[PDB]
């Protein structure tokens, strides 16, 4: 697993447990 609970393409990482929508407009490096 690369993110907590992704639904699109969040740039954030599992190592901090983002568990949300940190930047739907970004989509850069999921």
Residue 25 CB coordination number (10 Å): 6
Check: CB of residue 20 under 8 Å from CB of residue 7.
Answer: no
* Torsion angle (degrees, nearest 10) of CA 19, 22, 24, 27: -100
Experimental method: NMR
Q: Strand locations in 1-30, DSSP E?
A: none
Check: CB of residue 11 under 8 Å from CB of residue 23.
Answer: yes
* Residue listed under structure tokens 């992704």: 6
Reading the block at residue 2, the tokens are 């690369």
DSSP 1-30: --SSS-SS--S--GGGT--S-S-TTT-S--
Domain count, the chain: 1
Domain that holds residue 17: 1-30
């Amino acid at each position: 697993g690369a993110i907590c609970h992704p639904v699109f393409c969040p740039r954030r990482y599992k190592q901090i447990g983002t568990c949300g929508l940190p930047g739907t407009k970004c989509c850069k490096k999921p």
